[PDB]
Design an enzyme around this catalytic site. Structure first.
Site, PDB file in Angstrom:
ATOM      1  N   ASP A  46       0.838  -1.188   0.000  1.00  0.00           N
ATOM      2  CA  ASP A  46       0.000   0.000   0.000  1.00  0.00           C
ATOM      3  C   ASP A  46       0.881   1.248   0.000  1.00  0.00           C
ATOM      4  O   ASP A  46       2.103   1.172  -0.146  1.00  0.00           O
ATOM      5  CB  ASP A  46      -0.962  -0.041   1.183  1.00  0.00           C
ATOM      6  CG  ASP A  46      -0.279  -0.437   2.468  1.00  0.00           C
ATOM      7  OD1 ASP A  46       0.465  -1.439   2.454  1.00  0.00           O
ATOM      8  OD2 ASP A  46      -0.487   0.244   3.490  1.00  0.00           O
TER       9      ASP A  46
HETATM   10  C1  LIG Z   1       5.893  12.412  17.458  1.00  0.00           C
HETATM   11  C2  LIG Z   1       4.692  13.333  17.647  1.00  0.00           C
HETATM   12  C3  LIG Z   1       3.790  13.356  16.417  1.00  0.00           C
HETATM   13  C4  LIG Z   1       2.826  12.175  16.374  1.00  0.00           C
HETATM   14  C5  LIG Z   1       1.377  12.634  16.252  1.00  0.00           C
HETATM   15  C6  LIG Z   1       0.689  12.081  15.007  1.00  0.00           C
HETATM   16  C7  LIG Z   1      -0.217  10.897  15.332  1.00  0.00           C
HETATM   17  C8  LIG Z   1      -1.423  10.810  14.400  1.00  0.00           C
HETATM   18  C9  LIG Z   1      -2.082   9.436  14.470  1.00  0.00           C
HETATM   19  C10 LIG Z   1      -3.483   9.426  13.867  1.00  0.00           C
HETATM   20  C11 LIG Z   1      -3.463   9.627  12.355  1.00  0.00           C
HETATM   21  C12 LIG Z   1      -4.601   8.871  11.677  1.00  0.00           C
HETATM   22  O1  LIG Z   1      -4.921   7.806  12.080  1.00  0.00           O
HETATM   23  S1  LIG Z   1      -5.468   9.598  10.259  1.00  0.00           S
HETATM   24  C13 LIG Z   1      -6.403   8.285   9.426  1.00  0.00           C
HETATM   25  C14 LIG Z   1      -7.175   8.897   8.264  1.00  0.00           C
HETATM   26  N1  LIG Z   1      -8.228   8.007   7.819  1.00  0.00           N
HETATM   27  C15 LIG Z   1      -8.371   7.760   6.399  1.00  0.00           C
HETATM   28  O2  LIG Z   1      -7.634   8.281   5.636  1.00  0.00           O
HETATM   29  C16 LIG Z   1      -9.461   6.831   5.881  1.00  0.00           C
HETATM   30  C17 LIG Z   1      -9.582   6.664   4.371  1.00  0.00           C
HETATM   31  N2  LIG Z   1      -8.476   5.880   3.853  1.00  0.00           N
HETATM   32  C18 LIG Z   1      -7.435   6.524   3.075  1.00  0.00           C
HETATM   33  O3  LIG Z   1      -7.503   7.686   2.863  1.00  0.00           O
HETATM   34  C19 LIG Z   1      -6.273   5.703   2.518  1.00  0.00           C
HETATM   35  O4  LIG Z   1      -6.640   4.354   2.489  1.00  0.00           O
HETATM   36  C20 LIG Z   1      -5.010   5.854   3.367  1.00  0.00           C
HETATM   37  C21 LIG Z   1      -5.336   5.654   4.844  1.00  0.00           C
HETATM   38  C22 LIG Z   1      -4.395   7.232   3.143  1.00  0.00           C
HETATM   39  C23 LIG Z   1      -4.002   4.797   2.933  1.00  0.00           C
HETATM   40  O5  LIG Z   1      -3.504   5.184   1.687  1.00  0.00           O
HETATM   41  P1  LIG Z   1      -2.890   4.024   0.698  1.00  0.00           P
HETATM   42  O6  LIG Z   1      -3.169   2.670   1.302  1.00  0.00           O
HETATM   43  O7  LIG Z   1      -3.542   4.130  -0.657  1.00  0.00           O
HETATM   44  O8  LIG Z   1      -1.403   4.212   0.548  1.00  0.00           O
END
Ligand SMILES: CCCCCCCCCCCC(=O)SCCNC(=O)CCNC(=O)[C@H](O)C(C)(C)COP(=O)(O)O
Ligand SMILES: CCCCCCCCCCCCCCCCCC(=O)OC[C@H](COP(=O)([O-])OCC(O)COP(=O)([O-])OC[C@@H](COC(=O)CCCCCCCCCCCCCCCCC)OC(=O)CCCCCCCCCCCCCCCCC)OC(=O)CCCCCCCCCCCCCCCCC
Ligand SMILES: CCCCCCCCCCCCCCCCCC(=O)OC[C@H](COP(=O)([O-])OCC(O)COP(=O)([O-])OC[C@@H](COC(=O)CCCCCCCCCCCCCCCCC)OC(=O)CCCCCCCCCCCCCCCCC)OC(=O)CCCCCCCCCCCCCCCCC
Ligand SMILES: CCCCCCCCCCCCCCCCC[C@@H](O)O[C@H](CO[C@H](O)CCCCCCCCCCCCCCC)COP(=O)(O)OCC[N+](C)(C)C
Ligand SMILES: CCCCCCCC/C=C/CCCCCCCC(=O)OC[C@H](COP(=O)(O)OCCN)OC(=O)CCCCCCC/C=C/CCCCCCCC
Lengths: 55, 67, 128, 98, 52, 459, 55, 88, 80, 124, 178, 110
Positions: free
Chosen positions: H43
């Protein structure tokens, strides 16, 4: 590529510092003061194409 | 002195650098120990610090709460 | 949850912390496309002359000429005497002069008054 | 995702041209066609300047009063003066707190 | 000019400008050899309070 | 001293009778010879001046000014021949004639024994400068600049003339020697106050004083290179020389009439140093530098102490040389790129290293690096002002800082950084330009070696 | 100081992650002295020199 | 002196070496023309991790706009060659 | 010059703190697919290192022996 | 430290003031006191050019140490006994200063307590 | 640096950039390698936990919250590669870069040395001069009547064509010129 | 201080030139054995800086501390001098621990 200039620059700073250290009057001490200041300005900005060095 | 890159292995070491490093560490420790043996007073102090509480009034010459 | 970061004039707001970027609309996309198109047209116009073998000299930048002319020669024609303009001009052009005049006049009057009374310790004050 | 075929082709062509140009930057063996004692350092850099400075101080700077001023040497009890020959008396019979 | 993207192929890499775009009135103040307005990890008037 | 005057009036027909391709060579050679001849005037006495005749005299204050004028003429000739290549022969001869007339007028002006003759020559210097600015300048602004150059002077100088003749109706003479020997105090009356103003305002405008300086950036930017050199180097010093001469009859009124002029001078020194930090034009930066330095000289002349007079003379000479050199340095880049914008051509040290060295030396001399005569003059004026009032060291100190900043700013903006990609017409520096900068800079350090030649009669 | 620094550095080997305190931020960013005094005085000076002194 | 003159063969060898140390990729199945998305079944986040591993291997940072487009080891080798002016 | 890379199959996370990391990630159901890439920093001659107190006492043994010999000689040199 | 805490937290009335000290006559508690003497004359101390702050009551040992240092120049480890003697004389001077401080503190506290007792007795 | 930017970034691109920045700053916080690997696996789990959200509103809300958390918990002094825009060698060698057209102003005595190099330079100049007009004509045909809408440039398509606007890209000074 | 400060800067520069102009301590690993002479020199310099007895920095810094302790002086200044002389050992420990101890963290091309 300009190591000769660098060595020359180092020697000029040393000369200005001896002028500063050995001074007996205030005018000569000021001459040495501003000389080392200017040589420091020139040597800090050795890489004059880099913005941070000039800053 | 030609030394080639290693790529995830320990770098090649020549005997001269290890000999120099060990000699200079040993001479630093020898100097420290020798100077502590012969110049201990510079670390522990030379003369005793007197306690003012143990000085009698005869030498301090304070009157016995009468005059 | 976490403490908030509030931007200032000399410490601006990060691009990833801007609320106005997380709530987008199709007209925003159209505006972004127009901006990119304008920038691409300007870039192509610059690059055509930049790569020209027969071009010798400086490519005139109308933006630089406009900036310099606006900063220098366009200021007086667009000036109007307003209460704000008049007040700022009078303050910043008169106040410093009178302030420094009062300071130096007071200092010199005190020095002269001390001199008349004969107590200033002017010994070895040969050079003036 | 990834490049487009036009982008890939342009990158390939530009890379080929750039590698050709970099190869052309290399130097043939003849490219720099140039057109047509031991301790002398201590003589021309130490002895001559010290000779000149000794001359200038001894016969020109010293020629005027108060140009070279040295602080007077320290005098301790038990010393003898070179010029007058006078000897300095000892120091007041120490209490000798041995 | 410090806030501008450093990974873009600017026409003037040092000044981070492009040919033909409008120039800020105070560009010489913001030439990035000078006053910088880039965001900081700790917000303003909190660094001011701590320093004071 | 006709041995200097007559050779210039002989330069006139020699230029007007020379071959079409030998005007520059002949003019340069003979102007250098005249400068060498004028070098003999530095042999000054310690008590009085060289009184050659009833009409001409030379003092220890005017002799360096004459030497600087005679040295500047060949430099102007060398700087002018680049951009005058396409002109016709008659117009080139006319340009050289205008420069020669300006030099002759200045030479008589600095040595006149009477105040009226000095005024007449000091006003005759206007015509060649105006003709040069309004005829051989490049842009359309020159005409306006010419007007600003002319009336600003005359509105200040015409009242002086009246004052002058009035003095001759009262004292009976205007010769400087009789005026100095028969000086009397000026009473406290409105008539004497207005006579003081009439005698002072002309030279105040010529310096220029802050608030009366609006003509200078126009005139010094819109004029050709030789015009800029002669305006910054010598023509600004006429006001200082005249004020020094005329303050002998204005005491003790000056003791309290110097206040507003002193405050204007100090605050405008700060203001123009601050203006120099934000300038998009490279010539305007040098012009405002000139304003700041002349404000320093005004303060020195106004406080009226021997140390201030010595510093004023030294600073006048040093600033003339420095500003001429900086104008030439800017003109080289302008001739290369045909634009005066400072941020246009950048990183020039990579392409022109020796010119980068010349820029560095000129900028270092501008910010008064010890032991240059720039610093000698500035420090003498600073000490005199500190004696006048201990608080002055604040304002002067601020200036001493700000100056340095903008100086280095200019350097770092033009020589450092990365070269402009699209500018590809930057040719290697000619021998003429390098010789011009060398002939500007070497006399500065030579005078540093012997600083008593430019310290004036109070030395 | 040797002992306390050594203990604090040995602590970094543990598998623990915590967000920094304000004291760490103060120490790391040089008391915020460059962040305030290199932005406020320079900005005010340049703004006043263009807006007021020049224009 | 300084670093040896990095060559294309060395860059390809290092890229393949770092790739063969990744657990989510079979060593034998990997070729210099293998696609990360289609052939390998990874991915986007796996591609990001591989790009960071490349940066850590070669000690320089690849901008994101240039990083997203790289999809096969040949593209990585070409990008590193162009960034470092390697022609041989 | 003309040096080739060592084989990639010798880098293993067994017997290193990377094994401990994989063990803790296993209890949470997660995995670390990059451990072999960092295994080289623990595998070869970089396996062990001295402590801070060991670093400070680098050449203490030779220096101490030389000091002891010198003191012994000085104690038997005053007997002249 | 303890004297600092005693003065700055306890009763400062009975605590000596380093700037204003001694506040009692030198012969107040003592019947007769010997005038402290000097071994180095002003002239010898001037010719030696010690310093203006080194001209204390222990100047003679410093003068001998300096003379030996000048005499034994190439061997810079031979001037040990006289350096020890100068160090000892400085230590004695410091001990005398400590004795003066203790004397002043005890006299101040005793005088103030005795005056308070006399006032209390007269007020009864 | 080499690729033409687009009008906007997609949500996937924003998430990927946030992932890269978070991992880099976490490595800055966790100095040692094993600790970095442990917390990098934890961060990857946190990222792929919400990978399958179909509601774009909630996805952008999570992205907003993650951005705010990252800004609060960022390293004040992150690790920067030496030649990156914040590194200690970013523009170090820009002073050693000299444009090629400077060689056009060399004295004939200077050009007497290096004859073969200048022969090759003449060949390259002739190639540029012959290809300029074809590049210009290709640019005109490909571009849409309403001006270009992106900074991308077409490649060569014909027999012996060259990609338009190639000279200043191909003849870059170098990365380590002197 | 001239001596050991200049030599500490040369040791740092040797490390920087060794690892391809890298100055961050977070990416310098186990150099105790890879750079024996550099390690020895830096250890000696850090000891001298921290006023280790009978070394170069001892004969000046130790006397300075004892002189400020026995003076009629500001108490806040004395406290700050003591805290600073503790922090000196603190940051020297930081340098040694992060640069010369532990496992390598530099790029694999050695
Ligand atoms: C060190 C201090 C900094 C740390 C702080 C930061 C921590 C943040 C943790 C939380 C972040 C999240 O979970 S944010 C999660 C956001 N949710 C989504 O995006 C759902 C829809 N899915 C998609 O967009 C794609 O499948 C994708 C996921 C991009 C995959 O891309 P590919 O498969 O095509 O490569
Ligand atoms: C103490 C020194 C002793 C020297 C003895 C010999 C003195 C001869 C002096 C002759 C006049 C100087 C030359 C002027 C023109 C420049 C020459 C040139 O074109 O060079 C290219 C040429 C070829 O090089 P290239 O490969 O083409 O280089 C390409 C680039 O240009 C790249 O070139 P670059 O990057 O190498 O640049 C050249 C270089 C040098 O170029 C210059 O900058 C020259 C001007 C220096 C600055 C002057 C302005 C500031 C005010 C200074 C006033 C000093 C006046 C002294 C009296 C002078 C009388 C002639 O630039 C600098 O190094 C910066 C100079 C900073 C000086 C700091 C000290 C300030 C003064 C300190 C006190 C001075 C008095 C000391 C005594 C006090 C009591 C003890 O190289 C040289 O000519 C040699 C350079 C030598 C540098 C010396 C710099 C110090 C000189 C200070 C004054 C010396 C006074 C001498 C009398 C005794 C005192
Ligand atoms: C026996 C008689 C003598 C008595 C002396 C005193 C008795 C007590 C003995 C010991 C006492 C101290 C023990 C250790 C100190 C704590 C060290 C520490 O790091 O704790 C962790 C903790 C932060 O650690 P972290 O952020 O989690 O670590 C991040 C990672 O580790 C990032 O990791 P990393 O790799 O970046 O490394 C972090 C780095 C550093 O990490 C940090 O950034 C934290 C900085 C802590 C060091 C500061 C210590 C020096 C304090 C000077 C303060 C001067 C006054 C400032 C005025 C501020 C005014 C607002 O760690 C180190 O390298 C070592 C740190 C220091 C260890 C050496 C300590 C020796 C000096 C202190 C003891 C002195 C002993 C001799 C003195 C004898 C004199 C008679 O520190 C603190 O939270 C407390 C710091 C104390 C600040 C006091 C200022 C007051 C704060 C509240 C003010 C309320 C205002 C109310 C309103 C007012 C309106 C205007
Ligand atoms: C852009 C810059 C241009 C250049 C500026 C040139 C500066 C010229 C200013 C002239 C300096 C002072 C002029 C007169 C000297 C004193 C001024 C006055 O303030 O002093 C008091 C004067 O008192 C009052 O001011 C009365 C005068 C009021 C009329 C003057 C007009 C003031 C308004 C400001 C107008 C701005 C002038 C410039 C126009 C451009 C002293 O009182 P008094 O002791 O009794 O008079 C002394 C003379 N005696 C001895 C013969 C009696
Ligand atoms: C005595 C009178 C003057 C006293 C000084 C008052 C303040 C002076 C303000 C000067 C304004 C000048 C404006 C133009 C300057 C040129 C522009 C400039 O310098 O750019 C700012 C440049 C860039 O910032 P960096 O952090 O390096 O960022 C680089 C990485 N991106 O940094 C600077 O140079 C800022 C310097 C301004 C300092 C002003 C504040 C200093 C105040 C000191 C007062 C304390 C007095 C000390 C008393 C000691 C006890 C006797």
């Amino acid at each position: 590529p300009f190591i000769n200039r660098f060595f020359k620059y180092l020697l000029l700073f040393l000369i200005t510092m001896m002028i500063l250290v050995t001074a007996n009057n205030l005018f000569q001490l000021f001459i040495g003061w501003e000389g080392v200041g200017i040589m420091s300005f020139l040597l800090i900005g050795w890489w004059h194409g880099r913005t941070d060095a000039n800053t | 002195v030609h030394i080639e890159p290693r790529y995830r292995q320990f770098p090649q070491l020549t005997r001269s650098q290890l000999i120099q490093a060990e000699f200079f560490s040993a001479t630093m420790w020898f100097w420290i120990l020798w100077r502590f043996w012969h110049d201990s007073d510079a670390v522990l102090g030379h003369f005793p610090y007197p306690d003012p509480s143990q000085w009698t009034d005869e030498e301090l010459g304070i009157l016995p709460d009468d005059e | 949850s976490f403490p908030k970061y509030k931007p200032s004039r000399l410490a601006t707001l990060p691009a990833t912390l801007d609320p106005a970027e997380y709530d987008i609309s199709p007209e925003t996309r159209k505006a972004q496309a127009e901006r990119l198109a304008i920038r691409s047209r300007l870039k192509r116009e610059y690059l055509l002359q930049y790569n020209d073998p027969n071009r010798l000299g400086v490519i005139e930048d109308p933006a630089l000429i406009r900036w310099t002319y606006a900063r220098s020669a366009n200021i007086y024609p667009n000036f109007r005497p307003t209460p704000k303009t008049s007040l700022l001009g009078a303050l910043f052009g008169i106040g410093p002069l009178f302030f420094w005049y009062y300071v130096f006049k007071t200092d010199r009057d005190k020095k002269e008054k001390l001199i008349q009374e004969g107590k200033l310790d002017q010994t070895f004050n040969i050079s003036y | 995702s990834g490049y487009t075929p036009d982008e890939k082709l342009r990158l390939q062509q530009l890379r080929e041209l750039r590698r050709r140009w970099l190869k052309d930057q290399e130097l043939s063996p003849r490219e720099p066609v140039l057109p047509p004692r031991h301790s002398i350092f201590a003589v021309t850099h130490v002895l001559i300047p010290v000779w000149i400075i000794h001359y200038y101080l001894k016969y020109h700077v010293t020629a005027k009063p108060y140009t070279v001023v040295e602080r007077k040497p320290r005098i301790f009890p038990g010393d003898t003066i070179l010029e007058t020959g006078e000897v300095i008396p000892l120091m007041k019979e120490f209490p000798d707190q041995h | 000019q410090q806030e501008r993207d450093p990974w873009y192929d600017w026409d003037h890499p040092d000044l981070r400008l492009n040919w033909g775009e409008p120039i800020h009135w105070d560009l010489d103040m913001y030439i990035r050899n000078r006053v910088d307005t880039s965001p900081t990890p700790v917000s303003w008037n909190t660094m001011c309070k701590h320093l004071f | 001293m006709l041995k200097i005057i007559i050779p210039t009036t002989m330069l006139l027909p020699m230029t007007w009778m020379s071959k079409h391709n030998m005007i520059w060579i002949n003019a340069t050679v003979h102007s250098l010879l005249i400068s060498l001849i004028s070098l003999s005037l530095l042999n000054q006495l310690g008590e009085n001046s060289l009184n050659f005749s009833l009409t001409f005299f030379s003092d220890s204050l005017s002799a360096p000014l004459l030497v600087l004028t005679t040295w500047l003429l060949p430099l102007m000739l060398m700087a002018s021949q680049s951009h005058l290549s396409k002109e016709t022969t008659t117009r080139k001869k006319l340009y050289i004639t205008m420069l020669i007339l300006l030099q002759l007028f200045l030479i008589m002006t600095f040595t006149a024994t009477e105040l009226i003759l000095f005024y007449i020559l000091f006003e005759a210097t206007l015509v060649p400068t105006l003709i040069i600015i309004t005829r051989w300048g490049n842009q359309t602004e020159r005409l306006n600049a010419g007007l600003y150059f002319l009336f600003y002077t005359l509105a200040g100088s015409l009242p002086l003339l009246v004052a002058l003749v009035y003095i001759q109706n009262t004292t009976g003479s205007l010769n400087f020697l009789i005026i100095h020997y028969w000086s009397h105090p000026l009473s406290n009356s409105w008539s004497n106050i207005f006579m003081w103003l009439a005698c002072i305002m002309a030279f105040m405008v010529k310096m220029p004083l802050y608030g009366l300086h609006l003509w200078l950036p126009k005139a010094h930017v819109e004029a050709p290179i030789a015009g800029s050199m002669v305006l910054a180097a010598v023509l600004l010093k006429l006001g200082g020389y005249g004020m020094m001469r005329i303050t002998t009859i204005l005491n003790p009124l000056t003791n309290y009439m110097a206040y507003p002029f002193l405050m204007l001078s100090m605050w405008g020194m700060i203001m123009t140093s601050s203006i120099c930090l934000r300038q998009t034009d490279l010539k305007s930066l040098i012009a405002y530098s000139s304003v700041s330095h002349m404000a320093l000289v005004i303060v020195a002349i106004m406080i009226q102490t021997p140390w201030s007079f010595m510093g004023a003379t030294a600073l006048m000479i040093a600033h003339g040389l420095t500003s001429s050199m900086l104008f030439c340095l800017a003109n080289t880049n302008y001739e290369r790129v045909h634009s005066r914008t400072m941020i246009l051509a950048r990183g020039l040290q990579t392409l022109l290293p020796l010119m980068a060295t010349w820029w560095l030396v000129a900028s270092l001399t501008n910010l008064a690096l010890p032991p240059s005569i720039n610093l000698i003059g500035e420090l003498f004026i600073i000490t005199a002002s500190f004696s006048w009032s201990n608080i002055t060291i604040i304002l002067m100190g601020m200036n001493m800082m700000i100056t340095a900043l903008y100086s280095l700013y200019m350097l770092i903006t033009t020589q450092r950084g990365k070269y402009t990609h699209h500018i590809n017409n930057i040719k290697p520096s000619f021998t003429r330009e390098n010789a011009l900068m060398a002939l500007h800079i070497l006399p500065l350090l030579l005078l540093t070696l012997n600083p008593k030649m430019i310290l004036g009669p109070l030395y | 100081g040797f002992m306390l620094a050594l203990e604090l550095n040995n602590t970094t080997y543990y598998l623990k992650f915590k967000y920094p305190s304000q004291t760490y931020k103060f120490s790391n960013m040089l008391g915020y002295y460059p962040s305030i005094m290199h932005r406020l005085p320079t900005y005010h000076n340049l703004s006043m020199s263009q807006k007021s002194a020049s224009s | 002196s300084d670093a040896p003159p990095l060559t294309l063969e060395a860059i390809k060898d290092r890229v393949l070496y770092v790739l063969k140390l990744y657990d989510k990729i079979d060593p034998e199945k990997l070729s210099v023309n293998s696609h990360f998305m289609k052939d390998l079944g990874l991915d986007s986040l796996d591609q990001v991790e591989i790009i960071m591993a490349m940066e850590d291997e070669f000690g320089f940072e690849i901008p994101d706009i240039d990083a997203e487009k790289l999809m096969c080891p040949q593209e990585i080798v070409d990008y590193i060659a162009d960034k470092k002016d390697v022609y041989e | 010059s003309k040096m080739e890379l060592p084989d990639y199959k010798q880098w293993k996370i067994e017997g290193t703190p990377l094994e401990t990391v994989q063990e803790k990630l296993a209890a949470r159901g997660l995995r670390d697919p990059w451990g072999r890439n960092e295994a080289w920093r623990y595998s070869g001659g970089f396996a062990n290192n001295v402590s801070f107190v060991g670093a400070l006492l680098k050449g203490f043994k030779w220096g101490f022996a030389a000091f002891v010999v010198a003191v012994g000689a000085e104690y038997y040199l005053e007997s002249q | 430290g303890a004297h600092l805490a005693r003065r700055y937290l306890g009763d400062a009335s009975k605590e000596p003031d380093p700037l204003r000290m001694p506040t009692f006559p030198p012969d107040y508690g003592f019947p007769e006191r010997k005038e402290r003497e000097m071994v180095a004359t002003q002239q010898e101390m001037n010719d030696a050019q010690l310093m203006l702050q080194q001209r204390d009551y222990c100047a003679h040992y410093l003068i001998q140490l300096l003379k030996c240092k000048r005499d034994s120049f190439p061997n810079f480890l031979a001037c040990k006994h006289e350096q020890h003697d100068w160090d000892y004389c400085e230590h004695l001077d410091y001990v005398k200063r400590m004795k003066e401080f203790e004397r002043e503190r005890r006299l101040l506290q005793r005088k103030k307590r005795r005056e308070q007792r006399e006032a209390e007795m007269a007020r009864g | 640096a080499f690729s033409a930017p687009a009008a906007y970034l997609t949500h996937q691109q924003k998430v990927l950039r946030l992932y890269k920045r978070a991992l880099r700053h976490l490595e800055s916080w966790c100095v040692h390698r094993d600790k970095y690997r442990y917390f990098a696996c934890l961060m990857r789990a946190r990222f792929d936990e919400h990978k399958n959200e179909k509601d774009m509103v909630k996805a952008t809300q999570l992205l907003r919250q993650a951005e705010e958390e990252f800004w609060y918990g960022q390293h004040p002094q992150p690790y920067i590669f030496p030649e990156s825009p914040g590194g200690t060698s970013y523009e170090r060698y820009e002073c050693y870069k000299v444009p090629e057209w400077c060689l056009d102003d060399w004295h004939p005595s200077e050009k007497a040395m290096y004859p073969d190099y200048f022969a090759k330079r003449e060949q390259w100049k002739r190639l540029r001069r012959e290809s300029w007009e074809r590049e210009v004509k290709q640019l005109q045909e490909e571009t849409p009547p309403g001006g270009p809408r992106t900074e991308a440039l077409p490649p060569a398509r014909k027999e012996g064509d060259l990609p338009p606007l190639w000279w200043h890209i191909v003849t870059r000074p170098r990365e380590r010129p002197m | 201080h001239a001596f050991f400060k200049a030599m500490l800067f040369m040791c740092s520069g040797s490390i920087i030139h060794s690892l391809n102009d890298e100055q961050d301590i977070r990416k310098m690993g186990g150099l105790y054995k890879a750079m024996p002479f550099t390690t020895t020199a830096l250890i000696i310099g850090s000891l001298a800086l921290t006023g280790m007895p009978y070394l170069t920095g001892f004969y000046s810094k130790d006397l300075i501390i004892e002189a400020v302790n026995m003076s009629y002086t500001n108490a806040w200044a004395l406290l700050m001098t003591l805290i600073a002389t503790s922090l000196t050992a603190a940051y020297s420990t930081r340098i040694i621990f992060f640069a010369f101890l532990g496992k390598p963290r530099f790029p694999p091309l050695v």
